Amino acid sequence: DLIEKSKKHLWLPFTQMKDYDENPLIIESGTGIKVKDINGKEYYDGFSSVWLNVHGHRKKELDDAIKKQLGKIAHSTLLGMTNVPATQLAETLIDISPKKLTRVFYSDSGAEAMEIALKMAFQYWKNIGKPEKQKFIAMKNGYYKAPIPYVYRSESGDPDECRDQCLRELAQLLEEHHEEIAALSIESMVQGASGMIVMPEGYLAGVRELCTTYDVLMIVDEVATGFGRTGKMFACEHENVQPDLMAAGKGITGGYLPIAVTFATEDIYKAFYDDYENLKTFFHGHSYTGNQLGCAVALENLALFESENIVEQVAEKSKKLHFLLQDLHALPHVGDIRQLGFMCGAELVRSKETKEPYPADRRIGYKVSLKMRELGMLTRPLGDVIAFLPPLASTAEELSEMVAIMKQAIHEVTSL
Amino acid sequence: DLIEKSKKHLWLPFTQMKDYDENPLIIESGTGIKVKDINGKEYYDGFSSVWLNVHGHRKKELDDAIKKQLGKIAHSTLLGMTNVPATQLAETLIDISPKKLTRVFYSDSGAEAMEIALKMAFQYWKNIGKPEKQKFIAMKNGYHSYKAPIPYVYRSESGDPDECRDQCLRELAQLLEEHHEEIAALSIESMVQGASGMIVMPEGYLAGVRELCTTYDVLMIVDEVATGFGRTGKMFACEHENVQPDLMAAGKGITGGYLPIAVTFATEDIYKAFYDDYENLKTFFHGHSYTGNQLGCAVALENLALFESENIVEQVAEKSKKLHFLLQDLHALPHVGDIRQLGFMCGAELVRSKETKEPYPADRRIGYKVSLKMRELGMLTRPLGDVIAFLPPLASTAEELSEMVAIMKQAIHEVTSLED
Numbered sequence: 001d002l003i004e005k006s007k008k009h010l011w012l013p014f015t016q017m018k019d020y021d022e023n024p025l026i027i028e029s030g031t032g033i034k035v036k037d038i039n040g041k042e043y044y045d046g047f048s049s050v051w052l053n054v055h056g057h058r059k060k061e062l063d064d065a066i067k068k069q070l071g072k073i074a075h076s077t078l079l080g081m082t083n084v085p086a087t088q089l090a091e092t093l094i095d096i097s098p099k100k101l102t103r104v105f106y107s108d109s110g111a112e113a114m115e116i117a118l119k120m121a122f123q124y125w126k127n128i129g130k131p132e133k134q135k136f137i138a139m140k141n142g143y144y145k146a147p148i149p150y151v152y153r154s155e156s157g158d159p160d161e162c163r164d165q166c167l168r169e170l171a172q173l174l175e176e177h178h179e180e181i182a183a184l185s186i187e188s189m190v191q192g193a194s195g196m197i198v199m200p201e202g203y204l205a206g207v208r209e210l211c212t213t214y215d216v217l218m219i220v221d222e223v224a225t226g227f228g229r230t231g232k233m234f235a236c237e238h239e240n241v242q243p244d245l246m247a248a249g250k251g252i253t254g255g256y257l258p259i260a261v262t263f264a265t266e267d268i269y270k271a272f273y274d275d276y277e278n279l280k281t282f283f284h285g286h287s288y289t290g291n292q293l294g295c296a297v298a299l300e301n302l303a304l305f306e307s308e309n310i311v312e313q314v315a316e317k318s319k320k321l322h323f324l325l326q327d328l329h330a331l332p333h334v335g336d337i338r339q340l341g342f343m344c345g346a347e348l349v350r351s352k353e354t355k356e357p358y359p360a361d362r363r364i365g366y367k368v369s370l371k372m373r374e375l376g377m378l379t380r381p382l383g384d385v386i387a388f389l390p391p392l393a394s395t396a397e398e399l400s401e402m403v404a405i406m407k408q409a410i411h412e413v414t415s416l
Numbered sequence: 417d418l419i420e421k422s423k424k425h426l427w428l429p430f431t432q433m434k435d436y437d438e439n440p441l442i443i444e445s446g447t448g449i450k451v452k453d454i455n456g457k458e459y460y461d462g463f464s465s466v467w468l469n470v471h472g473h474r475k476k477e478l479d480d481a482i483k484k485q486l487g488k489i490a491h492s493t494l495l496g497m498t499n500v501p502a503t504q505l506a507e508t509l510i511d512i513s514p515k516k517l518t519r520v521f522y523s524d525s526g527a528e529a530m531e532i533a534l535k536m537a538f539q540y541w542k543n544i545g546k547p548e549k550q551k552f553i554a555m556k557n558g559y560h561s562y563k564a565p566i567p568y569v570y571r572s573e574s575g576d577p578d579e580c581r582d583q584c585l586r587e588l589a590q591l592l593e594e595h596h597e598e599i600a601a602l603s604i605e606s607m608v609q610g611a612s613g614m615i616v617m618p619e620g621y622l623a624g625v626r627e628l629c630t631t632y633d634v635l636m637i638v639d640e641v642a643t644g645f646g647r648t649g650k651m652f653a654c655e656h657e658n659v660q661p662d663l664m665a666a667g668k669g670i671t672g673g674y675l676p677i678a679v680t681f682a683t684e685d686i687y688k689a690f691y692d693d694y695e696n697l698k699t700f701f702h703g704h705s706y707t708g709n710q711l712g713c714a715v716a717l718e719n720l721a722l723f724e725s726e727n728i729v730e731q732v733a734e735k736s737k738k739l740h741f742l743l744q745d746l747h748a749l750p751h752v753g754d755i756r757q758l759g760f761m762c763g764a765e766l767v768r769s770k771e772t773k774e775p776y777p778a779d780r781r782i783g784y785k786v787s788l789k790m791r792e793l794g795m796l797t798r799p800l801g802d803v804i805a806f807l808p809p810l811a812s813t814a815e816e817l818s819e820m821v822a823i824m825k826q827a828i829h830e831v832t833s834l835e836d
């Protein structure tokens with residue numbers, strides 16, 4: 001009846017409940033990079049619990065640090081005071097992140113880390129003495145507007161040409177309006193929910209140049225892409241960018257608990273530092289900010305990154321997956337395949353010559369994902385882009401098994 | 417070392433770090449209703465860690481459930497599927513919630529639980545045919561748009577509650593008469609304005625807000641984040657007027673204070689409007705990644721199981737009788753303007769003179785200077801400007817309360833007296 005009960009009471013995030021009612025799924029537990037439902041059936045975790053599960057479920061040394069931190073204290077506040085593991089994690093996060101990012105402002109979630117970034121950005125200009133700086137630049141498809149080098153559906157198909165066109169179009173937009181912009185928000189290297197659109201080489205760097213040149217702050221959303229995943233600690237390493245502000249989460253705790261961070265340059269911190277009377281204080285916060293348990297599990301997740309060398313591991317297991325996922329090209333209705341590190345997606349198309357998309361009512365992304373659930377694998381389709389973002393743990397043979405279960409399930413339905 | 421560290425790397429919420437640098441503080445541990453800083457010192461947690469903590473620090477039962485749960489699975493997603501604790505907790509949450517509220521949408525914070533409610537309420541009307549329904553009504557100074565007045569008795573002409581009560585209810589009617597077809601929802605704290613300064617509403621203010629909201633087809637958003645799960649003397653504060661909100665937000669107390677879990681509650685009417693085939697674009701495109709954490713739901717399950725066992729709710733009701741008398745002492749101080757309380761939510765409002773009702777000026781920092789004095793005396797609290805906010809754990813005993821209130825009297829006395 002737990003199934004029956006999940007229909008009566010819940011209301012699930014980013015899902016249409018009529019499709020859940022027709023196909024229920026309730027997990028009980030999980031081990032390694034797998035999970036088990038309540039009428040015991042086991043799956044892979046192809047979407048690593050939506051882009052946050054680093055070393056699998058039941059990982060020993062994370063289960064360890066939570067238990068330990070229950071030994072001391074589970075939650076005390078960061079409002080006006082602080083606590084030990086937040087204080088320690090902060091130090092670790094300053095060292096493992098771009099050098100210009102000196103500060104750290106915690107919150108419960110990715111979206112909260114970005115809203116926080118926007119609010120610092122807006123409030124920084126207001127503090128220093130340039131209130132004109134209000135407007136923002138969203139990057140088209142960004143989960144004013146500026147376009148992102150989406151080269152597969154471009155005019156020339158050429159990365160460098162698409163890139164430089166997107167840079168130029170941004171540059172024109174900055175040329176004309178910069179003296180009223182405050183900040184620019186961009187996902188670090190890969191637009192996630194937009195279909196896993198990898199940015200071509202030199203894009204991010206161009207944005208950084210143009211932001212510096214034009215006195216707009218660069219905000220870099222590293223929530224999906226951070227903590228391994230891209231085959232670096234943070235995806236903005238791939239071009240040596242220092243964001244002015246950067247939002248992080250998901251894989252900060254190993255997958256276990258909800259913590260997020262907003263990193264901030266010291267120049268930015270300084271703008272909010274002054275006597276209380278002036279109302280310069282950044283007035284933002286949440287009540288479970290600096291959770292001891294979250295900070296403790298994240299500290300040991302951050303230790304594992306350094307000891308078990310999980311980042312460098314990922315960069316070698318990717319190469320394997322470069323060719324092993326180029327094997328998807330063989331299938332007829334799989335018009336493009338993208339990756340950066342473990343961050344992977346296969347865009348489905350009706351015609352390879354025309355790259356024509358399927359209709360969205362033909363439901364092909366979702367219909368595929370149900371057939372993986374048939375064959376013991378879990379993912380989420382972004383439209384008709386099937387996502388493949390598996391645990392960083394996941395060994396090169398599982399990396400290989402999933403990709404076939406994926407490929408098998410695509411072909412089974414994409415023939416229809 | 418940690419002190420020097422905290423000062424060089426952290427950016428803390430709702431705090432001038434310049435202040436944190438004259439007066440830093442780093443908790444290491446806690447035991448029942450006490451916390452222990454790094455230099456050994458002990459404090460009463462007289463703000464329940466900002467209105468979260470219910471049973472005490474290091475409570476075995478809650479300690480146990482997280483370990484229990486840990487050896488199943490720490491986190492599996494609610495995007496498109498579910499998990500066992502969330503599905504159980506929800507059943508539970510439905511029984512203790514009001515009747516009309518039969519869905520549970522989950523999230524990581526109170527702020528988020530409100531944010532979801534606004535989007536649900538906003539989008540609700542789009543999905544049914546009335547998209548012109550789109551503006552909200554915010555109750556003035558409402559920490560969670562036409563602003564609508566809310567009865568603050570102490571500084572109200574009347575001095576009489578019901579006159580301040582009914583006067584505000586009408587002003588909301590004059591708003592609702594001439595603007596209701598544009599209005600999606602109304603947003604209101606359940607029984608007490610927290611951040612505003614622990615301002616308690618007259619009985620049947622919230623009743624009257626709810627009967628008007630029905631008469632004009634506006635949705636009633638009830639924020640129970642600060643006032644939920646015991647704090648007022650009921651499991652939910654709106655029970656003080658039997659009230660049936662269309663959307664209710666919760667967080668905080670829900671996990672006894674251990675983890676972050678928060679919930680938006682919805683009526684089955686609302687939920688209905690998002691039920692369809694995907695084609696129709698009826699869906700609610702929202703919901704964070706750590707939605708339905710096993711560890712937070714597990715800790716919450718147990719927290720509520722304790723609520724059920726010990727009878728924490730009637731216990732607070734019991735102990736609040738004591739608390740009111742215990743707070744009577746505070747009114748004997750020259751500068752304590754006024755003492756507001758419902759359940760464990762109390763506020764002593766400070767003033768230059770308790771005859772003019774004239775507050776102190778903002779730069780003199782009378783709330784902050786007292787909060788520090790309390791720290792010095794071994795108590796943690798956070799002011800709401802010159803409103804000083806006592807909110808002790810719901811496990812707090814009769815004598816702990818007397819000691820916390822004593823420290824508070826000592827503190828307010830010593831700082832107000834000195835400003836002369």
Ligand SMILES: Cc1ncc(COP(=O)(O)O)c(/C=N/CCCC[C@H](N)C(=O)O)c1O
Nearest residue numbers: 286287430525526527560610639641642798
């Ligand atoms: C009705 C209500 N909703 C939401 C929140 C915050 O929910 P969260 O985002 O943490 O999940 C609070 C206060 N929450 C505590 C915040 C501190 C209050 C005040 N700024 C102060 O300085 O004490 C609240 O009173």
Ligand SMILES: Cc1ncc(COP(=O)(O)O)c(CN)c1O
Nearest residue numbers: 109110111143192223224704705
């Ligand atoms: C770029 C970005 N930012 C924020 C989020 C959401 O994070 P949260 O659910 O914790 O807000 C996502 C989800 N993948 C994302 O891709």
